[PDB]
Amino acid sequence: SSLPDLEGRANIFRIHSKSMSVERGIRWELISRLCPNSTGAELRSVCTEAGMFAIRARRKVATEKDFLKAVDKVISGYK
């Protein structure tokens, strides 16, 4: 209907990772620049995916690298 701005996108990502086991300084502005014109739950899924890449690599704390893997899977990933 309207989509979120660079600011809002980071805000989604930050508020969302609170309930997630995640490593310290993940550059959320940068992650948001990789999800342009991306839906609410699209970004939420990039988090679910990052969580999966962590579990996949037998990890509890999800890397920024796990989020990059997550973006390439969800955002750049054609159905």
Binding site: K69, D72, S76, Y78
Partner: peptide, 10 residues
């Protein structure tokens, strides 16, 4: 090939 396979294919 790890972090960028998909967007490269694109």
């Amino acid at each position: 090939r790890a972090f960028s396979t998909n967007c490269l294919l694109q």
